[PDB]
Amino acid sequence: LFGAIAGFIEGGWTGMVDGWYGYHHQNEQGSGYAADQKSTQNAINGITNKVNSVIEKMNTQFTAVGKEFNKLERRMENLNKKVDDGFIDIWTYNAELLVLLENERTLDFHDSNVKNLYEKVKSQLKNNAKEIGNGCFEFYHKCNDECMESVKNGTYDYPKYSEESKLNREK
Amino acid sequence: KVRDQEGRINYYWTLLEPGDTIIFEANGNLIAPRYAFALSRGFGSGIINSNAPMD
């Protein structure tokens, strides 16, 4: 676990409907909910390949399990029963454990993606913004929709607002 | 000679289904049945070859 989901970020947003991970901004123009398309798309590709790897790795040949034996062949019937029960037990154990462990792999993957998004935004903003907990940043400068979109796609231009942020911070 | 004897007795068995008859015809060399066993069957089990106490 990485501490983002059910961690320093408490709960999810029912408002964000276009993706798994994303931002919620609040400016003078208004607030919103935008999903991070790059991280969400990477997660979608990974989860799709995991599901496909689980499904398509099972290949079988045409077989018929059922067999019939007479009364004088009971060692036959018992051996057939043994092979059938053994295969069923092995497959049941394997399937249950595989699902159990892959659920933890998927949830950890989502937690890591959220934390990585948080760290990316933090490294972009540097000291131009303050961390106020809950995965939430407060800007020392004045941002419009261009600034918010710039933070979102990954082209923030810290030097543009460095001076104003310094003036507002040291006050 | 085995068990003091040279002659041999071959032992045979079969399971009569409920609602069936067995007919023995013999002009000699018959070791006839005297006691039979009505056998209701159960779960598959086995025979353990051991020398251990029983509790």
Side-chain angles (χ1 to χ4, degrees), chain A residues 66-121:
Chain A
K67 274 150 182 13
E68 84 266 329
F69 296 104
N70 71 56
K71 280 270 285 141
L72 210 67
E73 330 173 326
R74 275 274 298 273
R75 315 175 282 173
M76 271 308 176
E77 199 189 356
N78 288 12
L79 183 56
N80 192 37
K81 219 173 40 56
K82 199 215 302 195
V83 309
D84 290 323
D85 300 324
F87 288 144
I88 291 163
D89 287 355
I90 289 167
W91 283 114
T92 315
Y93 195 73
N94 282 8
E96 283 163 313
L97 280 207
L98 169 95
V99 170
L100 280 190
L101 301 173
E102 281 205 15
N103 292 355
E104 213 90 60
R105 299 300 291 181
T106 299
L107 298 176
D108 296 344
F109 184 57
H110 289 304
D111 201 334
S112 165
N113 289 344
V114 174
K115 194 174 187 16
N116 290 1
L117 194 40
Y118 180 81
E119 293 307 317
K120 271 180 49 169
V121 170

Coordinates of all heavy atoms in Angstrom, one line a residue, chain A residues 66-121:
Chain A
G66 N -16.4 -37.9 -18.4 CA -17.2 -39.0 -18.0 C -16.8 -40.4 -18.5 O -16.4 -40.5 -19.7
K67 N -16.8 -41.4 -17.6 CA -16.5 -42.7 -18.0 C -17.4 -43.7 -17.2 O -17.9 -43.3 -16.1 CB -15.0 -43.1 -17.7 CG -14.1 -42.7 -18.8 CD -12.7 -42.4 -18.3 CE -11.9 -42.0 -19.5 NZ -12.7 -41.8 -20.7
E68 N -17.7 -44.8 -17.8 CA -18.6 -45.8 -17.2 C -17.9 -47.1 -17.0 O -17.1 -47.5 -17.9 CB -19.9 -46.0 -18.0 CG -19.8 -46.9 -19.2 CD -19.5 -46.2 -20.4 OE1 -19.9 -45.0 -20.6 OE2 -18.8 -46.7 -21.3
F69 N -18.1 -47.8 -15.9 CA -17.4 -49.0 -15.5 C -18.5 -50.0 -15.0 O -19.5 -49.6 -14.5 CB -16.3 -48.8 -14.5 CG -15.2 -47.9 -14.9 CD1 -15.1 -46.6 -14.5 CD2 -14.2 -48.4 -15.8 CE1 -14.1 -45.8 -15.0 CE2 -13.2 -47.6 -16.2 CZ -13.1 -46.3 -15.8
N70 N -18.1 -51.3 -15.0 CA -19.0 -52.3 -14.5 C -18.7 -52.6 -13.1 O -18.0 -51.8 -12.4 CB -18.9 -53.6 -15.4 CG -17.6 -54.3 -15.2 OD1 -17.2 -54.7 -14.1 ND2 -16.9 -54.5 -16.3
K71 N -19.4 -53.6 -12.5 CA -19.2 -53.8 -11.1 C -17.9 -54.4 -10.7 O -17.4 -54.2 -9.6 CB -20.4 -54.7 -10.6 CG -21.7 -54.0 -10.4 CD -21.8 -53.5 -9.0 CE -22.1 -54.6 -8.0 NZ -21.4 -54.4 -6.7
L72 N -17.3 -55.2 -11.6 CA -16.0 -55.9 -11.3 C -14.8 -55.0 -11.6 O -13.7 -55.4 -11.4 CB -15.9 -57.2 -12.2 CG -15.1 -58.3 -11.7 CD1 -15.8 -58.9 -10.5 CD2 -14.9 -59.4 -12.7
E73 N -15.1 -53.7 -12.0 CA -14.0 -52.8 -12.1 C -14.3 -51.6 -11.2 O -14.9 -50.6 -11.6 CB -13.9 -52.3 -13.6 CG -14.3 -53.3 -14.6 CD -14.3 -52.8 -16.0 OE1 -14.7 -51.6 -16.1 OE2 -14.0 -53.5 -16.9
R74 N -13.9 -51.7 -9.9 CA -14.0 -50.6 -9.0 C -12.7 -49.9 -8.7 O -12.8 -48.7 -8.4 CB -14.6 -51.2 -7.6 CG -16.1 -51.3 -7.6 CD -16.7 -50.0 -7.2 NE -16.3 -49.6 -5.8 CZ -16.9 -50.0 -4.7 NH1 -18.0 -50.8 -4.8 NH2 -16.5 -49.6 -3.6
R75 N -11.6 -50.5 -8.9 CA -10.3 -49.8 -8.9 C -10.2 -48.8 -10.0 O -9.7 -47.7 -9.8 CB -9.2 -50.8 -8.9 CG -9.4 -52.0 -8.0 CD -8.2 -53.0 -8.1 NE -8.4 -53.9 -9.3 CZ -7.5 -54.7 -9.8 NH1 -6.4 -54.9 -9.2 NH2 -7.8 -55.4 -10.9
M76 N -10.8 -49.2 -11.2 CA -11.0 -48.2 -12.2 C -11.8 -47.0 -11.8 O -11.4 -45.8 -12.0 CB -11.7 -48.9 -13.4 CG -10.8 -49.5 -14.4 SD -9.7 -48.2 -14.8 CE -8.6 -49.0 -15.9
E77 N -13.0 -47.3 -11.3 CA -13.9 -46.2 -10.9 C -13.3 -45.3 -9.9 O -13.3 -44.0 -10.0 CB -15.2 -46.7 -10.5 CG -16.3 -45.7 -10.5 CD -17.6 -46.2 -9.9 OE1 -17.7 -47.4 -9.4 OE2 -18.6 -45.4 -9.8
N78 N -12.6 -45.9 -8.9 CA -11.9 -45.1 -7.9 C -10.7 -44.3 -8.4 O -10.5 -43.2 -8.0 CB -11.4 -46.0 -6.8 CG -12.6 -46.5 -5.9 OD1 -13.8 -46.4 -6.3 ND2 -12.3 -47.2 -4.8
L79 N -9.9 -44.8 -9.4 CA -8.8 -44.1 -9.9 C -9.4 -42.9 -10.8 O -8.8 -41.8 -10.7 CB -8.0 -45.0 -10.8 CG -6.7 -44.3 -11.4 CD1 -5.9 -43.7 -10.3 CD2 -5.9 -45.4 -12.1
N80 N -10.4 -43.1 -11.5 CA -11.0 -42.1 -12.3 C -11.5 -41.0 -11.4 O -11.3 -39.8 -11.6 CB -12.1 -42.6 -13.2 CG -12.6 -41.6 -14.2 OD1 -11.8 -40.9 -14.8 ND2 -13.9 -41.6 -14.5
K81 N -12.2 -41.4 -10.3 CA -12.7 -40.4 -9.3 C -11.5 -39.6 -8.7 O -11.6 -38.4 -8.5 CB -13.4 -41.2 -8.2 CG -14.6 -40.4 -7.7 CD -15.4 -41.3 -6.7 CE -14.5 -42.2 -5.8 NZ -13.6 -41.3 -5.0
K82 N -10.4 -40.3 -8.4 CA -9.2 -39.7 -7.9 C -8.7 -38.6 -8.8 O -8.4 -37.5 -8.4 CB -8.2 -40.7 -7.5 CG -7.2 -40.1 -6.5 CD -5.8 -40.6 -6.7 CE -5.7 -42.1 -6.6 NZ -4.3 -42.6 -6.5
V83 N -8.5 -38.9 -10.1 CA -7.9 -38.0 -11.0 C -8.9 -36.8 -11.2 O -8.4 -35.6 -11.2 CB -7.6 -38.6 -12.4 CG1 -6.7 -39.9 -12.2 CG2 -8.8 -38.9 -13.2
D84 N -10.2 -37.0 -11.2 CA -11.1 -35.9 -11.4 C -11.1 -35.0 -10.1 O -11.0 -33.8 -10.3 CB -12.5 -36.5 -11.6 CG -12.7 -37.2 -12.9 OD1 -12.1 -36.7 -13.9 OD2 -13.4 -38.2 -13.0
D85 N -11.2 -35.6 -8.9 CA -11.2 -34.8 -7.7 C -9.9 -34.0 -7.5 O -9.9 -32.9 -7.1 CB -11.5 -35.7 -6.5 CG -12.8 -36.4 -6.6 OD1 -13.8 -35.8 -7.1 OD2 -12.9 -37.5 -6.1
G86 N -8.8 -34.7 -7.9 CA -7.5 -34.0 -7.8 C -7.4 -32.8 -8.7 O -7.0 -31.7 -8.3
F87 N -7.8 -32.9 -10.0 CA -7.8 -31.8 -10.9 C -8.7 -30.7 -10.4 O -8.4 -29.5 -10.5 CB -8.2 -32.3 -12.3 CG -7.1 -33.1 -13.0 CD1 -7.5 -34.1 -13.8 CD2 -5.8 -32.8 -12.8 CE1 -6.5 -34.8 -14.4 CE2 -4.8 -33.5 -13.4 CZ -5.2 -34.5 -14.2
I88 N -9.9 -31.1 -9.9 CA -10.9 -30.1 -9.4 C -10.3 -29.3 -8.3 O -10.4 -28.1 -8.2 CB -12.2 -30.7 -9.1 CG1 -12.9 -31.2 -10.4 CG2 -13.1 -29.7 -8.4 CD1 -14.0 -32.2 -10.2
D89 N -9.7 -30.0 -7.3 CA -9.1 -29.4 -6.1 C -8.0 -28.4 -6.5 O -7.9 -27.3 -6.0 CB -8.6 -30.4 -5.1 CG -9.8 -31.1 -4.4 OD1 -10.9 -30.7 -4.6 OD2 -9.5 -32.1 -3.7
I90 N -7.1 -28.9 -7.4 CA -5.9 -28.1 -7.8 C -6.5 -26.8 -8.5 O -6.0 -25.7 -8.1 CB -5.0 -28.8 -8.8 CG1 -4.2 -29.9 -8.0 CG2 -4.0 -27.9 -9.5 CD1 -3.5 -30.9 -8.9
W91 N -7.4 -26.9 -9.4 CA -7.9 -25.8 -10.1 C -8.7 -24.8 -9.2 O -8.6 -23.6 -9.3 CB -8.8 -26.2 -11.3 CG -8.0 -26.7 -12.5 CD1 -8.0 -27.9 -13.0 CD2 -7.1 -25.9 -13.3 NE1 -7.1 -28.0 -14.0 CE2 -6.6 -26.7 -14.2 CE3 -6.7 -24.5 -13.2 CZ2 -5.7 -26.2 -15.2 CZ3 -5.9 -24.1 -14.2 CH2 -5.3 -24.9 -15.2
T92 N -9.5 -25.4 -8.2 CA -10.2 -24.5 -7.3 C -9.2 -23.7 -6.4 O -9.4 -22.5 -6.3 CB -11.1 -25.4 -6.4 OG1 -11.8 -26.3 -7.2 CG2 -12.1 -24.5 -5.7
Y93 N -8.2 -24.4 -5.9 CA -7.2 -23.7 -5.1 C -6.5 -22.6 -5.9 O -6.3 -21.4 -5.4 CB -6.2 -24.7 -4.5 CG -5.4 -24.1 -3.3 CD1 -5.9 -23.9 -2.1 CD2 -4.0 -23.8 -3.5 CE1 -5.2 -23.5 -1.1 CE2 -3.3 -23.4 -2.5 CZ -3.8 -23.2 -1.3 OH -3.1 -22.7 -0.2
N94 N -6.1 -22.9 -7.1 CA -5.3 -22.0 -7.9 C -6.2 -20.8 -8.3 O -5.7 -19.7 -8.2 CB -4.8 -22.7 -9.2 CG -3.6 -23.6 -8.9 OD1 -3.2 -23.7 -7.8 ND2 -3.0 -24.1 -10.0
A95 N -7.4 -21.0 -8.7 CA -8.3 -19.9 -9.1 C -8.6 -19.0 -7.9 O -8.5 -17.8 -8.0 CB -9.6 -20.5 -9.6
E96 N -8.9 -19.6 -6.7 CA -9.2 -18.7 -5.6 C -8.0 -17.9 -5.2 O -8.1 -16.7 -5.0 CB -9.7 -19.6 -4.4 CG -11.1 -20.1 -4.6 CD -11.4 -21.3 -3.6 OE1 -10.6 -22.2 -3.6 OE2 -12.4 -21.3 -3.0
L97 N -6.8 -18.5 -5.1 CA -5.6 -17.8 -4.7 C -5.2 -16.8 -5.7 O -4.8 -15.7 -5.3 CB -4.5 -18.8 -4.4 CG -4.5 -19.5 -3.0 CD1 -3.1 -19.8 -2.6 CD2 -5.2 -18.6 -2.0
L98 N -5.4 -17.1 -7.0 CA -5.0 -16.1 -8.0 C -5.9 -14.9 -8.0 O -5.4 -13.8 -8.0 CB -5.1 -16.8 -9.4 CG -5.1 -15.9 -10.6 CD1 -3.6 -15.9 -11.2 CD2 -6.0 -16.4 -11.7
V99 N -7.2 -15.1 -7.8 CA -8.1 -13.9 -7.7 C -7.7 -13.1 -6.4 O -7.7 -11.9 -6.4 CB -9.5 -14.3 -7.7 CG1 -10.5 -13.2 -7.3 CG2 -9.9 -14.8 -9.1
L100 N -7.5 -13.8 -5.3 CA -7.2 -13.1 -4.0 C -6.0 -12.3 -4.1 O -6.0 -11.1 -3.6 CB -7.1 -14.2 -2.9 CG -8.3 -14.8 -2.3 CD1 -8.0 -15.6 -1.1 CD2 -9.3 -13.7 -1.9
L101 N -4.9 -12.8 -4.8 CA -3.7 -12.0 -4.8 C -3.8 -10.9 -5.9 O -3.2 -9.8 -5.7 CB -2.5 -13.0 -5.1 CG -2.3 -14.1 -4.1 CD1 -1.3 -15.1 -4.6 CD2 -1.9 -13.5 -2.7
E102 N -4.5 -11.2 -7.0 CA -4.6 -10.2 -8.1 C -5.4 -9.0 -7.6 O -5.2 -7.9 -8.1 CB -5.1 -10.8 -9.3 CG -4.0 -11.6 -10.1 CD -4.3 -11.7 -11.6 OE1 -5.2 -11.0 -12.1 OE2 -3.7 -12.5 -12.3
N103 N -6.3 -9.2 -6.7 CA -7.1 -8.1 -6.2 C -6.2 -7.1 -5.4 O -6.3 -5.9 -5.6 CB -8.3 -8.6 -5.3 CG -9.3 -9.3 -6.2 OD1 -9.2 -9.3 -7.4 ND2 -10.3 -9.9 -5.5
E104 N -5.3 -7.7 -4.6 CA -4.4 -6.8 -3.9 C -3.4 -6.2 -5.0 O -3.1 -5.0 -4.8 CB -3.8 -7.7 -2.8 CG -3.4 -6.9 -1.6 CD -4.6 -6.8 -0.6 OE1 -5.0 -7.9 -0.2 OE2 -5.1 -5.7 -0.4
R105 N -3.0 -6.9 -6.0 CA -2.1 -6.2 -7.0 C -2.8 -5.0 -7.7 O -2.2 -4.0 -7.8 CB -1.7 -7.2 -8.0 CG -0.9 -8.4 -7.4 CD 0.4 -7.8 -6.7 NE 1.4 -7.3 -7.7 CZ 2.5 -6.8 -7.3 NH1 2.9 -6.7 -6.1 NH2 3.3 -6.3 -8.3
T106 N -4.1 -5.2 -8.1 CA -4.9 -4.1 -8.7 C -5.1 -3.0 -7.8 O -4.9 -1.8 -8.2 CB -6.2 -4.7 -9.2 OG1 -6.0 -5.7 -10.2 CG2 -7.0 -3.6 -9.8
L107 N -5.5 -3.2 -6.5 CA -5.7 -2.1 -5.6 C -4.4 -1.3 -5.3 O -4.4 -0.1 -5.2 CB -6.4 -2.6 -4.3 CG -7.8 -3.2 -4.5 CD1 -8.3 -3.8 -3.3 CD2 -8.7 -2.2 -5.2
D108 N -3.3 -2.1 -5.1 CA -2.0 -1.4 -4.9 C -1.6 -0.6 -6.2 O -1.0 0.5 -6.1 CB -1.0 -2.4 -4.6 CG -1.2 -3.1 -3.3 OD1 -2.0 -2.6 -2.5 OD2 -0.6 -4.2 -3.0
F109 N -1.9 -1.1 -7.4 CA -1.7 -0.4 -8.6 C -2.4 0.9 -8.6 O -1.8 2.0 -9.0 CB -2.0 -1.3 -9.8 CG -1.7 -0.7 -11.1 CD1 -0.4 -0.3 -11.4 CD2 -2.7 -0.6 -12.1 CE1 -0.2 0.3 -12.7 CE2 -2.4 0.0 -13.3 CZ -1.1 0.4 -13.6
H110 N -3.7 0.9 -8.3 CA -4.5 2.2 -8.2 C -3.9 3.1 -7.2 O -3.8 4.4 -7.5 CB -5.9 1.9 -7.9 CG -6.6 1.2 -9.1 ND1 -6.7 1.7 -10.3 CD2 -7.3 0.0 -9.1 CE1 -7.4 0.9 -11.1 NE2 -7.8 -0.1 -10.4
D111 N -3.6 2.7 -6.0 CA -3.0 3.5 -5.0 C -1.7 4.2 -5.5 O -1.5 5.4 -5.3 CB -2.8 2.7 -3.7 CG -2.7 3.6 -2.5 OD1 -2.3 4.7 -2.6 OD2 -3.0 3.1 -1.4
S112 N -0.8 3.4 -6.1 CA 0.4 3.9 -6.6 C 0.2 4.9 -7.7 O 0.9 5.9 -7.8 CB 1.3 2.7 -7.2 OG 2.3 3.2 -8.0
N113 N -0.8 4.7 -8.6 CA -1.1 5.7 -9.6 C -1.5 7.0 -9.0 O -1.1 8.1 -9.4 CB -2.2 5.2 -10.6 CG -1.7 4.0 -11.4 OD1 -0.4 3.9 -11.6 ND2 -2.6 3.3 -12.1
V114 N -2.4 7.0 -8.0 CA -2.9 8.2 -7.4 C -1.7 8.9 -6.7 O -1.5 10.2 -6.8 CB -4.0 7.9 -6.4 CG1 -4.3 9.2 -5.6 CG2 -5.2 7.4 -7.1
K115 N -0.8 8.2 -6.0 CA 0.3 8.8 -5.3 C 1.3 9.4 -6.3 O 1.8 10.5 -6.1 CB 1.1 7.8 -4.4 CG 2.0 8.5 -3.5 CD 2.6 7.5 -2.5 CE 3.5 8.2 -1.5 NZ 3.2 9.6 -1.4
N116 N 1.5 8.7 -7.5 CA 2.4 9.3 -8.5 C 1.8 10.5 -9.1 O 2.6 11.5 -9.4 CB 2.6 8.2 -9.6 CG 3.4 7.0 -9.1 OD1 3.9 7.0 -7.9 ND2 3.7 6.0 -9.9
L117 N 0.5 10.6 -9.3 CA -0.1 11.8 -9.8 C 0.1 13.0 -8.8 O 0.5 14.1 -9.2 CB -1.6 11.6 -10.1 CG -2.3 12.6 -10.9 CD1 -1.5 13.1 -12.0 CD2 -3.7 12.1 -11.3
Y118 N -0.1 12.7 -7.6 CA 0.1 13.7 -6.5 C 1.5 14.2 -6.5 O 1.8 15.4 -6.5 CB -0.3 13.2 -5.2 CG -0.1 14.1 -4.0 CD1 -1.0 15.1 -3.7 CD2 1.1 14.1 -3.2 CE1 -0.9 16.0 -2.7 CE2 1.2 15.0 -2.2 CZ 0.2 15.9 -1.9 OH 0.4 16.8 -0.9
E119 N 2.5 13.3 -6.6 CA 3.9 13.7 -6.6 C 4.3 14.5 -7.9 O 5.1 15.4 -7.8 CB 4.8 12.5 -6.5 CG 4.7 11.7 -5.2 CD 4.9 12.7 -4.0 OE1 5.8 13.5 -4.0 OE2 4.1 12.6 -3.0
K120 N 3.7 14.1 -9.0 CA 4.0 14.9 -10.2 C 3.5 16.3 -10.1 O 4.2 17.2 -10.5 CB 3.3 14.2 -11.4 CG 4.1 13.1 -12.1 CD 3.4 12.5 -13.3 CE 2.8 13.6 -14.2 NZ 2.2 13.0 -15.4
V121 N 2.3 16.5 -9.6 CA 1.7 17.8 -9.5 C 2.6 18.6 -8.5 O 2.8 19.8 -8.7 CB 0.2 17.8 -9.1 CG1 -0.2 19.2 -8.7 CG2 -0.6 17.2 -10.2

